[PDB]
Symmetry: C6
Subunit: 176 residues, 6 copies
Amino acid sequence: SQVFLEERLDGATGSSIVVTMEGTRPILAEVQALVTPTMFGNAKRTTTGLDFNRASLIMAVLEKRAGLLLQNQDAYLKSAGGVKLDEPAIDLAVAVAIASSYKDKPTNPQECFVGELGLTGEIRRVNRIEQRINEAAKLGFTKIYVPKNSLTGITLPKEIQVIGVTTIQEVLKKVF
Amino acid sequence: GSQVFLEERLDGATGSSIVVTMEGTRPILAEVQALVTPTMFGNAKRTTTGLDFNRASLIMAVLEKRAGLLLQNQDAYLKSAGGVKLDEPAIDLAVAVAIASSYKDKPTNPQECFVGELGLTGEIRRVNRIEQRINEAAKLGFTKIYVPKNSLTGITLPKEIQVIGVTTIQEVLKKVF
Amino acid sequence: SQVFLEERLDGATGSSIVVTMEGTRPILAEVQALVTPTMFGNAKRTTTGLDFNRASLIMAVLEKRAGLLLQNQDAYLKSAGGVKLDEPAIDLAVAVAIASSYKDKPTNPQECFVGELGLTGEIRRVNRIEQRINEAAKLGFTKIYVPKNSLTGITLPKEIQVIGVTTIQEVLKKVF
Amino acid sequence: GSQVFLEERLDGATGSSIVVTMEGTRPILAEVQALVTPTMFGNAKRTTTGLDFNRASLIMAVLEKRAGLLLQNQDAYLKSAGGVKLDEPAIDLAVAVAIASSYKDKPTNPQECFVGELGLTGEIRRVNRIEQRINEAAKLGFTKIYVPKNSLTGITLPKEIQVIGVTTIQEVLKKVF
Amino acid sequence: GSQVFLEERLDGATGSSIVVTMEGTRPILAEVQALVTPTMFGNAKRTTTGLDFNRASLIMAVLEKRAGLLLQNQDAYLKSAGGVKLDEPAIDLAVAVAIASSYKDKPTNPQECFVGELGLTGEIRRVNRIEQRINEAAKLGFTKIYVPKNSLTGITLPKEIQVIGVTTIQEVLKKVF
Amino acid sequence: SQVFLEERLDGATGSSIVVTMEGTRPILAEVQALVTPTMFGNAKRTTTGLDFNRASLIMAVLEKRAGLLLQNQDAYLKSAGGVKLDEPAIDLAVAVAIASSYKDKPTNPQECFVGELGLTGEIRRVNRIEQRINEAAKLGFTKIYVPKNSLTGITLPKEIQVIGVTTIQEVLKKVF
């Protein structure tokens, strides 16, 4: 947790932490977004470290289901440190980072997000959810948002608050 | 198996459908998702993940020319849930139903799944290993599966699941919606 | 033949059968086309299972040499079943399928087409023409169109009518 | 060999030419085809198969700047007959002649073939293995072959075929058309 | 090492900066060059060689949103000198300084080098193997190196070189320009 | 030298010779350029045998630092004979060939150019400069332009005039 909190400027917006996997190892990674209005041509969508199309899908869901008006906004996204983010579980952190920059409201650098985001705005389960809460807890994170359907039949550790969520709107209201 | 899709399906959520696709020789159940919304400015946007961009374009042209859905002025975002790569003719029907579901604002039944190639004249053409697909659907608790009508000839159906043979995309939309 | 005739809706237009090769084995494949007028931007040309550029060439030849006005038409092409069509011999079937959709006139599902199409509208010879007429005959096709220059020095089987052609216009007049 | 091209060549068919190209160490005869027609709407279309798109663009700029053919407002479709992949400098001359033939509406002689790289100042530059190319052309019954004039120095010509050494693209167009 | 850059640097030449990057485990010194000039017609041009096109776009958006440089109406051409491929987060700071130098028409000191990843909120984030980078800079006679301020914790500095830990891109521009 | 001089038409403009490397062997290659005004859309930049982006950079430097107005000019570039030119040292020859076509003034086919060109118009050193002057001399070239900073500590052969240069403007004035 500490290496992310030292790198987070005070009240810096447009970033979020994800618990992702390299092989079978769980890794913490920071997702960053910068949204500003488009001037000419198509709205700019430039990414590094995460798929361009995945970001487009996430921005369409955020507009249609959470009302953020992103169609006329340029978006620049990146994963800190050059970590390749290529799995469904990173959707939520990417969505939160975008909303954070759009809302100009920061996230807490001791919290992290795990979940696939469907086109109906739902937060879908992901694999190896137990290592994710464990790695997030073990490295000193206080709160982790996960798909609530991933919580069924699981033993929560008390070191970290585990917030089960089901929709992107529900997440935005808790976080912002 | 089947309710893991019913537990992930929000109540009355539109624009999704289940396909029985194949990875090697193993049959896999996968959810196709679509988001069709009117274009505001510029050209209509078409973004996909997990399935071929051109295949979706072809399917949308068929749905317009043969099922009357006016998709040329609508943006379309499509994805396969869970990062499953959908790369075979058999997924055409599920993609088409997912698109029609989002366009019609009417949901599909999360205990039903769709299998079939879609031709440019709107016909549902046969696919390989239809038996494993119907079996996998029954195995995992699905109640109904739509399959190519010509795939049924000389085949043994499981008792657990209704198998509806279809021949045209319009016939599917009217039974489903 | 029968597996193609059962899949062909009654009077369904914009499709045709080709006798192509997988390695040294001759295979029957159905080519499909859908032509409708273009609205904005460039005329749409979307393909799967066959090369985009090959279709563009075929559509330019059909306009310049057979008068079909395709420059203001969108075209969607595909090979049924996901079969990759990647050889000169498929030109004729692709051209006929396009003309069938453009003319709104169907082809006979018991007939098939074999030939390379040149830029002057000519039907050029192809390799292993004998297996192609044989495989077409053996699987119950009644008629096959082939390059007439491929017929020189060959023994025709009586099970199938073999129509030697030399130009795309001559083919369109026989078929439509 | 040579008449297999003359038998496939419609009477007075324009926009084609023969090249002696190389696959590994074997020389192959191939027909280059061009279709040049005026643009109706939008930007001029350039579609190719069997030869590099950029190489055709370069050749068309040379033909315009050095041979006066106005190609900027013309669509061009090019292909190599038989699916032969043309990927070497020696094919430039045949491609240029095929383009000029379609533009001028004047045919080439199907018993003639062209070998040479085309420079941006319109010069015909030497190519490798000129002897196998001229020999293969004679072997297969061709009557005339145009080759780079500098490729002839110190070389033994076959008696069966006229070998015309050329130096500029304009010189070729005037001898050929 | 250091003067080979000072000997190649024209007097008062703007738009260049030195980075300590890594090839495998070996640290390499490389010069990043930028050419920022106002757009005359059409959309702003962005051409790069030796470094990722998207990385430069991201860096230019950060410099505009966080350092006030108006780059949306400026063409940008970027390259790494010597054909060195720059493909790691640590080069962000040098690229940003090179861009700001060309935009501000103010040169950098060719005996200084820059190391750091640049975040979208303008922060300078830590990089790997900071010790070899600072050591290689000293080894080759550089007088000053800017590094991520958080990379210094628990590290032994060489006496030969000033090590300036920085935290924001604005702080760097004001110290450097 | 002789094989390049025989292929050079009298007063033919827009070409130049470079001493490049295939592995560790030094090779002579001819770079060609053709610049004409752009009509519609973006100015045409078509290349073969050398990188498209490298040519764009070189044309931007030639405009900003030597005043040649190339932004409204189409450019076609190629290496003679299909030789792949993929190293910093070819910059100078490419720049000279473009300027030659733009200025409508030829280069001498017995001269060659070696050097990387920086964004400030400077001619930067290249590796194995000694083989380059040697191969240029051995094959009968009379003059070679090289980066002057490459000359420090080197023994010049008298068979060939070696012109050390530092800027693209200085080169253009000597050559044109």
